[PDB]
Design a protein around this nucleic acid. Structure first.
Ligand SMILES: [Zn+2]
Lengths: 905, 323, 117, 43
DNA sequence: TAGG
């Protein structure tokens, strides 16, 4: 019954009556049973070699026939192959012996004819040291891996030799005697203490047993001893990589191991076919750090020859590669770097946001975002979760046993995820973005308060992830006939996901069904109903084939996998009903057509394996369609309702316009990747024409946003072109943003007023002269408007410069633009229309060659490129030159808006 | 010349034209309105010159500087003109108008003829600070460019119309632009309704020829156009239950590795007979194997495709080859 | 009114490719200056050899010389007894830091456009 | 006869990690321990 | 409602 005597002697066929008993049962991970004993003290009943024991090598091995090697001298080395392995316990280092009748025989590897026994008897890059220790085990760290802890420092690792009889007697309180052990000082990888680790040459012996009892079967730290043995003797890792692997593999156990799968199934060793999910989940990292192809660990070379150990003699300090976080840490350390990085005086810079009222200063602080790349941190985190699809809301999520993150998944670039066989699959991605969108409700009065606390009323974040499936690894989680029909259909258009009303069922007593969250698609059947034959499908039954498929209830979870242009397969279990996929709850906007079909709760979709675009004549006025579709690129996003400004992506237009898209209350939490920079395809929108003849789009209940790509990491400049001013007049295909180096002719008007920054009312000496109403704070901001008459060598134009662009249009230093702008604070309405110190300084300035100078403009057309312009004949004007008032036909004059103003040279 | 009512449509009429003084002294004046000069049919009302002062003649209230710019010499008639900021501004606009002989001056005004000698009446003039001759070099490079692009330029279908040619001429006018979709899109197989949802091929089908249900009749124009790719021998279909599924012969090569493995046994026959195989010696092992109604348009069109796999000797027509 | 001072190159005027009496705008680099009898010699190099022009600095008479710097001259090319051709200067301005390869480039595009008319 | 506790009786009972010391009543903890006392006799 |  597993006798384990200390300091053995050859009383083997005798010596019962052991009065120092100690028994330990099996420990709930051992299916073989076989508890053991701990006998404390002694029981009560060609030539010959000699020398002193030096190493003894501790390793009865297990190649094909068991053997251990002992060396001798005050050196000679002896190997022992036959069944006298019981001598391994009755040998101590230090004692002299008289071991007899040895023989000389050769050996493989290198022929040097080492001493080998017979039917004999016995009588009486960094480096590492070779210590000879003795201590006490005070705690265990990983019992299956072999990581024990000695005293207050100097951790142990018994993994690099064949240990299975040592796992029984290793509790806190044993007194070891290590003989020839490598000491690793700066192994790193998250560990701090030096680590002590023997090998095939070092003796690991015992001096006294433990007195304490075993702690507790935890079913969390007792499994996996055959997987850790596979990471040394087959997949030959090193000790800096072994201690990282045994730390990440229990960091994955906190995310999956009780509930996603089991502990005994995660930490199982790999069989021939494909088990051991726990090793496949580390293999992206272990392949670019310890690649396959290595010199094999020979048995006799570690003991007999010059010492070249399995890499404990020569090791490499490793910093931590992966460090798998949990999905709750990624969510709470994501909106902690979002508000620590929230600086309202960096979102609004100093010269431009000194001229904004309180209603426009706070509208530009409302929505913002940041993109963290977690594979750039100091431990370089790796995302891992189980892909779920919500049957109550319809959204995709990654999940573990701590929390869940929303996710946006693209298959490739400009290709959506449309495979429903990924629900319930482990997704492992190391290239991903962590988007946090900030939503701030603030009431700053002016620009001076942007570093003072007390003006933010509400702030909330929205954390999710974006990545491609080509940069990830999808693994299925292992689980611990002819009654099926099918029909293919080609999806044409998918509607929006929102609450809808339903028509009352016909013929019954009058009752209205509940308004539920639902959507529907419009498809077309590609054949008859196929029946399941084996694992495939048979021939279809013999067949307008348009059909609306209504998804509501628990069937709403298929929303993120249905995309136009793809061919799907609708599967229904149960008996072979003849008329099943022909017709039958119906929405209110689908009354009249008898071609609806409600998708049942136990049905299953699977994927059997360029979108629409309206032309650039969606900028027309007399329209009777009101449904447009285009691909665009988001420029800005504002919380007015949510307003998006998009630049169109049209291959035929050559400088395509900029539109505004408005999302409102039933559609108001929008899709995930609607960030500035992302390319997004919009199908059917509500095209409107405003009162000022501008074309804008709105979200209906039929929109189908699909994100084509993510915003890039680095934003490039791509500056404006350098047009002539006449090219905006003659011909078509012209920009609406360019440079056009020109020369100022005259100045039309100049206003320099001060306003209230709560309303836009004039403040004489800062006093809110609106009507006598109440205002909380006596603040005031300055405004400035000027109008010029610049001209190139080719044409002329009219440029309106707004505030802080009026300076450097007059050529004023910011020290003297500010001293000019507080002389107008006492009379708050200086206006000139081309009283002693002013109005004579400004009239002298705006008529001098220090203002009418050659300039380098950078402008935009003020006509708002969405605008419908009608063709009209030219007017008639006078143009007297010298003395003769003739008449000419004139086109309307160019009116521009300045973006910047520089000097020539 | 250009009529007076059409002058204001030219954008150079309201601009200060950057001309040479060789051109200013040689422009013809309009007989319609005196004071407007025509260069290449453009009405030139006002100019913009830059040159070197070579003469100063002062009167009571104006100066008359002579200006040379290496092309010509002309006379320019320049009319004479918080309290710590206004005063030092007036000593800045008086150093811009302190002009001696040898300075560079920019003069923007209008040409006024004076009985066969022309002058420029400057509305705006100043002294150009040109120490390293940069501005007068940049003008010598700019003025040939603005001439050649602006001042020398004068001032001023069956595919596109598919509704004219009818339906028996329109099936053969749709398949060749349907075929190009199959080329770069790596499409192995497709359905008939997949091409009826691409707007690149739908707008070229529902012409006003088919007023004689329109959306049911556009299935007939696609079916008779896809079939022309099949009688030509580029697409095909197998017996699978539905009649809208098609496969492209050019893309899939599991069929190409069944036409290549018949040479493994020299078409599974010894050579005591006629030398080699024939085009129809494949046919005894291809229709009985795969489809009995296989068309002969795709039987040797696959042999046109894998000819660069070092397969056999294409010694002549109507004849296969053995080893 | 004088004739226009058309741009010439210093190796064009030293080889006698310009008639006597016409107005020109060549350049050079100041090497000598005779204060007593009002003579300035400018120097330039075409591709391999030295070319020099003679300037009669008499109309802009109080002249502070700037030896070793570039100069723009503008005047009439007269001609003394037996091959001594001097430039009776009216404007003699001192430019230093001028992009001389860009200046004689800009003379080539101005001459090339005038040939295409 | 009627011999004492055998190797099969300790493998089919006392499965709570027992210990024994037939010398004398002693609470051995030179550094630390917890317990498991019993009074069986194996031979 | 959607620029002013
Ligand atoms: Zn107010």
């Amino acid at each position: 019954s597993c006798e384990l005597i200390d300091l053995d002697l050859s009383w083997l066929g005798h010596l019962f009556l052991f009065p120092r008993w100690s028994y330990l049962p099996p420990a709930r991970w051992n299916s073989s049973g076989e508890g053991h004993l701990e006998l404390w003290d002694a029981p009560v009943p060609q030539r010959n070699l000699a020398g002193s024991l030096v190493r003894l090598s501790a390793l009865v091995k297990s190649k094909q026939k068991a053997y251990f090697i002992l060396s001798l001298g005050r050196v000679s080395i002896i190997v022992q192959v036959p069944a006298q392995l019981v001598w391994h316990r009755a040998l101590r280092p230090g004692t002299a012996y008289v071991l007899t009748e040895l023989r000389v025989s050769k050996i493989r590897g290198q022929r040097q004819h080492v001493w080998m026994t017979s039917q004999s008897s016995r009588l009486l890059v960094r480096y590492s040291r070779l210590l000879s220790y003795s201590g006490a085990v005070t705690g265990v760290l990983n019992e299956p891996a072999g990581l024990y802890e000695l005293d207050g420092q100097l951790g142990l690792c018994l993994a690099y030799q064949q240990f299975r009889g040592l796992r029984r007697v290793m509790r806190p309180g044993v007194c070891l005697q290590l003989q020839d052990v490598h000491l690793l000082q700066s192994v790193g990888g998250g560990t701090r203490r030096p680590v002590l680790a023997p090998c095939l040459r070092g003796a690991v012996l015992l001096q006294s047993f433990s007195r304490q009892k075993p702690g507790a079967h935890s079913s969390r730290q007792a499994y996996g001893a055959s997987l850790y043995e596979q990471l040394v003797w087959e997949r030959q890792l090193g000790l800096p990589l072994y201690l990282w692997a045994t730390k990440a593999l229990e960091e994955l156990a906190c995310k999956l191991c009780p509930h996603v799968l089991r502990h005994h199934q995660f930490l199982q060793h790999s069989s021939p076919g494909s088990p051991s999910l726990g090793l496949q989940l580390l293999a992206p990292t272990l392949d670019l750090l310890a690649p396959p192809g290595s010199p094999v660990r020979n048995a006799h070379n570690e003991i007999l020859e010059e010492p070249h150990h399995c890499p404990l003699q020569k090791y490499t300090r490793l910093q931590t590669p992966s460090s798998f976080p949990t999905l709750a840490t990624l969510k709470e350390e994501g909106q902690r770097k979002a508000w620590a990085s929230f600086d309202p005086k960096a979102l609004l810079p100093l010269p431009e946001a000194s001229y904004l009222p309180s209603c426009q200063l706070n509208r530009r602080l409302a929505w913002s975002w940041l993109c963290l790349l977690p594979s750039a941190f100091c431990p370089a985190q790796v995302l891992l979760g189980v892909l779920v699809a919500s049957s109550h809301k319809g959204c995709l999520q990654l999940r573990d046993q701590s929390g869940s993150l929303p996710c946006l998944l693209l298959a490739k670039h400009s290709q959506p995820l449309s495979d429903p066989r990924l629900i319930g699959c482990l997704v492992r991605a190391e290239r991903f973005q962590l988007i946090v969108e900030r939503d701030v409700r603030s009431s700053f009065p002016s620009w001076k308060e942007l570093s003072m606390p007390g003006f933010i009323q509400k702030q909330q974040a929205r954390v999710y992830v974006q990545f491609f499936l080509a940069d990830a690894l999808i693994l299925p989680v292992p689980r611990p006939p002819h009654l099926g029909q099918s029909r293919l259909f080609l999806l044409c258009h998918k509607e929006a996901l929102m609450k809808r009303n339903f028509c009352v069922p016909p013929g019954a007593s009058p009752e209205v069904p509940k308004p539920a969250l639902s959507f529907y698609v419009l498809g077309s059947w590609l054949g008859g109903t196929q029946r399941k034959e084996g694992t495939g499908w048979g021939l279809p039954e013999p067949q307008d084939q348009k059909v609306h498929l209504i998804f509501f209830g628990s069937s709403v979870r298929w929303f993120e996998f249905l995309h136009p242009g793809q061919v799907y397969r609708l599967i229904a279990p149960g008996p072979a009903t003849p008329m099943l996929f022909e017709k039958d709850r119906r929405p209110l906007e689908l009354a009249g057509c008898a071609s609806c079909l409600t998708v049942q709760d136990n049905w299953t979709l699977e994927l059997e394996s360029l979108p629409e675009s309206s032309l650039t004549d969606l900028l027309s006025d007399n329209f009777t369609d009101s449904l447009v579709s285009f691909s665009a690129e988001i420029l800005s996003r504002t919380l007015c309702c949510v307003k998006l400004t998009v630049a169109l992506e049209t291959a035929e237009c050559e400088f395509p316009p900029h539109l505004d898209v408005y999302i409102e209350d039933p559609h108001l939490p929008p899709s995930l990747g609607l960030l500035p920079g992302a390319r997004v395809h919009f199908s059917q929108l509500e095209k409107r024409v405003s009162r000022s003849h501008n074309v804008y789009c709105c979200f209906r209940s039929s929109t189908y946003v699909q994100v084509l790509s993510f915003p890039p990491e680095t934003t490039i400049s791509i500056p404006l072109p350098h047009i002539y001013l006449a090219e905006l007049l003659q011909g078509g295909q012209s920009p609406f943003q360019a440079t056009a180096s020109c020369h100022i002719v005259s100045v039309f008007s100049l206003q320099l007023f001060w306003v209230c920054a709560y309303c836009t009312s004039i403040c004489r000496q800062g006093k809110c002269t609106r009507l006598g109403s109440t205002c909380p704070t006596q603040t005031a901001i300055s405004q400035a408007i000027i109008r010029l008459l610049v001209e190139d060598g080719t044409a002329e134009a009219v440029v309106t410069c707004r505030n802080h662009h009026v300076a450097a249009a007059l050529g004023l230093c910011p020290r003297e633009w500010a001293s000019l702008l507080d002389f107008v604070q006492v009379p708050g309405r200086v206006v000139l229309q081309f009283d002693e110190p002013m109005t004579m300084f400004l009239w002298t300035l705006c008529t001098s060659p220090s203002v009418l100078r050659p300039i380098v403009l950078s402008f935009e057309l003020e006509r708002k490129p969405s605008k419908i312009v009608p063709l009209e004949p030219p007017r008639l004007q006078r143009f007297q030159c010298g003395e003769l008032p003739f008449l000419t036909h004139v086109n309307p004059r160019l009116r521009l808006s300045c973006l910047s103003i520089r000097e020539s040279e | 010349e250009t009529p007076s009512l059409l002058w204001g449509l030219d954008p150079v009429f309201l601009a200060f034209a950057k001309l040479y003084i060789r051109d200013i002294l040689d422009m013809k004046e309009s007989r319609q309105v005196p004071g407007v000069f025509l260069y290449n049919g453009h009405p030139i009302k006002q100019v913009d010159v830059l040159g070197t002062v070579i003469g100063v003649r002062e009167r009571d209230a104006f100066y008359s500087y002579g200006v040379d710019d290496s092309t010509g010499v002309i006379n320019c008639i320049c009319w004479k003109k918080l309290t710590s900021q206004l005063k030092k501004l007036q000593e800045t606009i008086e150093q811009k108008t302190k002009i001696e002989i040898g300075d560079t001056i920019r003069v923007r005004g209008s040409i006024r003829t004076y009985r066969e000698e022309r002058e420029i009446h400057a509305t705006t003039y100043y002294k150009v600070d040109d120490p390293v001759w940069n501005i007068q070099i940049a003008r010598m490079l700019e003025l040939p460019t603005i001439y050649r692009k602006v001042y020398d330029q004068p001032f001023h279908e069956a595919l596109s119309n598919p509704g004219a040619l009818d339906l028996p001429s329109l099936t053969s006018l749709l398949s060749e632009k349907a075929k190009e979709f199959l080329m770069e899109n790596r499409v192995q197989s497709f359905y008939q309704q997949e091409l009826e949802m691409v707007e690149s091929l739908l707008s070229l089908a529902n012409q006003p020829v088919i007023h004689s249900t329109t959306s049911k009749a556009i299935h007939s124009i696609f079916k008779n156009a896809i079939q022309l790719l099949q009688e030509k021998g580029l697409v095909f279909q197998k017996d699978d239950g539905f009649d809208n599924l098609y496969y492209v012969t050019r893309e899939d090569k599991d069929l190409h590795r069944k036409i290549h493995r018949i040479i493994q046994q020299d078409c599974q026959k010894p050579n005591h007979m006629e030398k080699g195989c024939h085009f129809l010696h494949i046919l005894a092992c291809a229709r009985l194997s795969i489809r009995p109604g296989l068309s002969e348009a795709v039987l040797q069109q696959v042999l046109e495709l894998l000819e660069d796999q070092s397969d056999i000797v294409s010694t002549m027509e109507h004849y296969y080859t053995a080893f | 009114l004088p004739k226009p001072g058309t741009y010439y190159l210093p190796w064009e005027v030293s080889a006698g490719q310009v008639p006597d009496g016409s107005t020109l705008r060549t350049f050079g680099r100041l090497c000598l200056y005779d204060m007593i009898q009002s003579r300035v010699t400018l120097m330039a190099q075409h591709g391999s050899d030295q070319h020099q022009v003679l300037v009669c600095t008499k109309l802009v008479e109080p002249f502070h010389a700037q030896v070793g710097s570039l100069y723009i001259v503008l005047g009439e090319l007269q001609h003394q007894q037996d091959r001594g051709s001097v430039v009776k200067a009216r404007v003699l301005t001192c430019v230093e830091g001028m992009n001389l390869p860009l200046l004689e480039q800009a003379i080539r595009e101005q001459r090339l456009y005038k040939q295409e008319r | 006869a009627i011999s004492q506790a055998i190797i099969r009786l300790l493998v089919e009972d006392g499965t709570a990690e027992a210990v024994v010391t037939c010398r004398n009543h002693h609470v051995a903890a030179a550094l630390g321990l917890c317990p498991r006392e019993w009074a069986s006799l194996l031979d």
